[PDB]
Amino acid sequence: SGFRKMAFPSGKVEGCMVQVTCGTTTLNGLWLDDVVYCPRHVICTSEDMLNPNYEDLLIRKSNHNFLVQAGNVQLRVIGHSMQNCVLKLKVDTANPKTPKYKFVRIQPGQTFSVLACYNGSPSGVYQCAMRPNFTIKGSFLNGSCGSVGFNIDYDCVSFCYMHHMELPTGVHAGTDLEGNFYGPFVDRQTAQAAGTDTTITVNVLAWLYAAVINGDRWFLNRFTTTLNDFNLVAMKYNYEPLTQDHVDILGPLSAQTGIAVLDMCASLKELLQNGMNGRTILGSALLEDEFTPFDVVRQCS
Amino acid sequence: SGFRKMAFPSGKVEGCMVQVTCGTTTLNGLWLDDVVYCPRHVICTSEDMLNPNYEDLLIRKSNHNFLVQAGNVQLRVIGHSMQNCVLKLKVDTANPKTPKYKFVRIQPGQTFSVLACYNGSPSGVYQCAMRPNFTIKGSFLNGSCGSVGFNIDYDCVSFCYMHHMELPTGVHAGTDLEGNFYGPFVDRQTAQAAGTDTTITVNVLAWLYAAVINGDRWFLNRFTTTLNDFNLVAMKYNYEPLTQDHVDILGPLSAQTGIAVLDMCASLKELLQNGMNGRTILGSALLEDEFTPFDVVRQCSGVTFQ
């Protein structure tokens, strides 16, 4: 027993991280088959980033403008292209460490592991949720750009995130591996803010199930509720509405514990109104919303 | 910026994880060079669990009683010996993925990454601290025994923990990679219970220094404290005593923020007296004790957000 924020094992991804230099900018690349993926903004001076014309800045570049380094080994760049906000550097050499992989775009409320990297060197791994406002609460310093987010499904790595920028609130924004941003953000030094965030209701409920499974049960109560009744409480507390879809996904945990979701919603309803009455739940003073039902099921069974 | 419970990249350890089977018992082992390390309790049966005589149960074992499996490759065991509470199986192949490694025994307050493993397959990685009571607050189901804790400071894998058992209060107990338990625990299912746990004070201060580096200032105060007065207050909240050593170790974070250790101690005394009054620090509504001064410097910039 016990419950911890748990990343996927990162070795399949560690094997794919390279260093990418274009002028003065160094940051991180993802080396899969014979292509290296990184943020298109690598090609930008400071003056460039104020109002970049990537079409124009890119044609101006050539293959030898891109210094791709896998450890001590220069890869030869033999082609460059842009897909949305992601640069694709064709290389002479396929990655002999390429895993079974796909590119996936995740939904807000879904979690993934971030492998923070610096100068192409894996540094750290932590679990993150794609916030309802399409930010992630990351831990990123200069050089972190091109660090990737992923899930592992059996042996297949699902790449969902590439790190692009920090916002002025200290939260992080990036793209899927097809270069489409998560959230209403652009790769340009300009005025950009994190939309007001909301709490991921289905995840909070998954985490209360995990707490119950680990013998933390004080917050439980005889009551139940209805979607409508709860969702008006949720709405007030800046909580995502709970759909009939979320209640079904919780069915396993509702089964294993003998609390029905609307029974647990009753517990959560009271915690929002009345607080935690000084206690903690799985060593947290907060209602933790970055564990999915699947994260709780995967970890606890 | 940002601040996260951050584990080390687990790939160097993934490449060393194997399945060890003895009798009806399967757990994980650590395959380094020609040796697989696993908890010696793998060789116990039902009765053996209370008063195992490990030297007696081991002398009765042949190499071919130990079934080792690296993915699909069956490693052939060519030798066995015991060191304290760790079993060492010699095998006919040195693990080709053996990294630069070393074995270190850690002190309470130290942090490491745990690569949770079932049937020799890694399932996840997370950060833990050695609690002052010599347990760790892990996430370990049945079959997790032989999972290891590690640091990877500068391309060398320091192995510091191997998981042996869950105590009745849901906390976890294990050995160094030389098979010596952390704490007064033994690999017998006789009644044992962790000592009352305390908050890792030096770690809480390092985390407050992290909050200030990340731009949070609301909890500072115009006050200071003597080291002695801080200890007499902190210990009434079940906090570890802060030593001069702990004071010295915080000097660098003190220097980077320009807040004296004992000023930051006054802030902690007040946080302990007031709680958070609806606020949060680096995303937590409690005082966090599982980041070391070293962890704070590693994760944080060299520039403060003043």
Ligand SMILES: O=C1CCc2ccccc2N1
């Ligand atoms: O860590 C552990 C060791 C073995 C075990 C057995 C039964 C329930 C939980 C556990 N957890």
Ligand SMILES: [Cl-]
């Ligand atoms: Cl130590």
